[PDB]
Design a protein around this ligand. Structure first.
Ligand SMILES: [Cl-]
Ligand SMILES: [Cl-]
Lengths: 140, 138
């Protein structure tokens, strides 16, 4: 019964070596199956798109929690590593490792901030209980 | 062991930048105007929408290849929305619309239901994200 704050539409065609675009034209992407799976590579793929979206979403959640908590964040960057695995049921699944690099906090402060961000990020909430996510954080 | 692994690094906030380490994906970001930003660049909801549409289309073709089902064509639309929650902040919801050429409606529904089981995006969000699935045939 809740109203969408934002909606975006994407259309894909042409298979794993095809093409995908958002209706508003802001994202227009060629696709290719990676060399590691016997493809030609040379373009992006859904695992990269998920890794990129997750890194950016989680960085935003760190910044949001720090702003709400009045935490003295100087900078943050976010690394996501996304792996594809085969399932016993002949499907596929993702696994994820996240690594935050946070400036301005001591190591313990940063670990608590990242933990809170993990509860707020919409990607993290979308995959809870389904995807194993490993978190690490470094300060500098 | 992993079939495939990739790494992305994001920096600069909602109006920042994200890249994969192999350089195949390099993107400026922006907060959409609907959320108070300026738009003019993509965002994590569009990335998810695009990856889900491509991933689900690949799952349809994969199941069809395994089941020896001749497909004349497939295209995939995904629609991704953000909703405000009282508790956990914002939440994703998804509508998927497959367009399949060469199968009648019952055959296409069966194929799309199986694809939904195989697609890694679907299995990632299963039960946390409402996913409405529809199929049209031509
Ligand atoms: Cl759009
Ligand atoms: Cl990479």
């Amino acid at each position: 019964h809740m109203k969408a704050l934002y909606t975006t539409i994407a259309k894909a065609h042409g298979g794993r070596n095809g093409h995908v675009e958002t209706t508003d034209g802001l994202l227009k992407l060629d696709l290719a199956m990676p060399r590691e799976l016997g493809g030609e590579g040379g373009a992006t793929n859904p695992e990269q798109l998920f890794a990129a979206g997750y890194a950016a979403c989680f960085e935003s959640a760190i910044r949001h929690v720090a702003n709400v908590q009045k935490i003295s964040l100087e900078d943050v960057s976010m690394t996501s590593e996304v792996s594809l695995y085969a399932t016993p049921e002949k499907g596929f699944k993702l696994g994820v490792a996240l690594h935050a690099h946070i400036t301005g906090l001591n190591q313990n402060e940063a670990e608590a901030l990242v933990a809170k961000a993990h509860e707020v990020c919409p990607y993290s909430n979308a995959i809870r209980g389904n995807v194993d996510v490993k978190l690490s954080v470094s300060v500098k």
